[PDB]
Amino acid sequence: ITRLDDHYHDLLTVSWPVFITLITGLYLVTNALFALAYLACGDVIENARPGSFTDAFFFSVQTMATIGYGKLIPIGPLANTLVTLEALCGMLGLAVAASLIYARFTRPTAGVLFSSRMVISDFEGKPTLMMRLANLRIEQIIEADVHLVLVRSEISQEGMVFRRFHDLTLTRSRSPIFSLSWTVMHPIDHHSPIYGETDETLRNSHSEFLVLFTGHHEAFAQNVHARHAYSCDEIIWGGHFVDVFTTLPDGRRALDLGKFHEIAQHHHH
């Protein structure tokens, strides 16, 4: 929604193919511009068909890349001035292009799967709100933290209606090494802000649930971040996640992420 262009860094987020196309285009265009500049000055390039855009272009190219074959060369003090300018550009351009590439290499995704739903069901004798996460890569994430946050609408003494945030208590919230799957659980005890709440009351308060995940990925040697929001619709009351850890034919332990979004539910005549 509205608040009251060069700084467009789509450059960092777009796909590689697209990124290479933009770099490539910006590189053709900049040579197009220099070629024109040279033509503006006349025939200041030796050995170039007069007035020819082609030869002026490839001349630019060999100047900017610094290939400098030496068949085409500049003659004006005008040409040598542009050459000097074009040399700086090729240098800054490389320097920038490498900047953008190195960066793009270091804003990696978390590779983290969130279950499509939450459940509320008994664990250790209390109703418990749960969801789960999976590491989609072989590399491990170390010092993983997760937060499960309720956002709902509440009323102050002064009568003002506002969105309140509650960081829900988790049986475990820091995993020091996260490699496979992690079931995140919030025991709904007397202290829980959802204690006594039902699907209907959660609807009324416009309740939502955010999960936020952080950790240091060994795959990138840099911290990663992932989050997901759940609406009330997406809580299965009485659901239990299906085990994703299973034993193989041999007796090898296996993780089967195909079961990951599956939830068992009791059905009554």
Binder to its own copies among 40, 51, 99, 201 (CB under 8 A)?
A: 99
CB nearer to K ion: give 73 or 129: 73
CB nearer to its own copies: give 50 or 125: 125
Contact 143, 174 (CB under 8 A): yes
- 177 lines the binding site for its own copies (CB under 8 A): yes
Name the residue among 94, 104, 110, 109 with its Cα closest to residue 14: 104
First to last CA, the chain: 47
- 20 lines the binding site for its own copies (CB under 8 A): yes
Site for Ca ion in 52-81 (CB under 5 A): 66
- 173 lines the binding site for Cl ion (CB under 5 A): yes
The angle that helices 16-40 and 53-64 make with each other, rounded to 10 degrees, is 120
Backbone angles phi, psi at 221, to 5 degrees: 50, 40
CB nearer to its own copies: give 6 or 200: 6
CB nearer to Ca ion: give 21 or 80: 80
Name the minimum Å distance from CB 257 to K ion: 55
> CA 266, CA 269: separation in Å to the nearest integer?
10
> CA 72, CA 219: separation in Å to the nearest integer?
48
Report the partner that residue 196 touches, choosing among Cl ion, K ion, its own copies, none (CB closer than 5 to 8 A by kind): none
- Stretch near its own copies under the rule CB under 8 A, chosen from 34-42, 195-203, 231-239, 253-261: 253-261
- 221 lines the binding site for its own copies (CB under 8 A): yes
Quickly tell me which residue has 């793009």 as its tokens: 104
- 76 lines the binding site for Cl ion (CB under 5 A): no
- 225 lines the binding site for its own copies (CB under 8 A): yes
Binder to Cl ion among 20, 94, 136, 155 (CB under 5 A)?
A: 136
**x-or-dash string of contact with its own copies, 102-141, rule CB under 8 A:** xx-xxx--------------xxxx----------x-xxx-
Q: Which residues lie below 8 Å from residue 123, measured CB to CB, with a gap of 6+?
A: 130, 185, 187
Backbone angles phi, psi at 201, to 5 degrees: -70, -40
- 140 lines the binding site for Cl ion (CB under 5 A): no
Q: Which residues of 180-210 are buried (b: 16+ CB within 10 A; e: fewer)?
A: ebbbbbbbbeeebbbeebeeeebeebebbbb
Name the minimum Å distance from CB 150 to Cl ion: 13
The residue type found at 24 is T
Number of amino acids touching its own copies (CB under 8 A): 94
Joined together, the tokens standing for residue 52 give: 């020819």
In eight-state DSSP terms, residue 115 is P
Name the minimum Å distance from CB 160 to its own copies: 8
- 63 lines the binding site for its own copies (CB under 8 A): yes
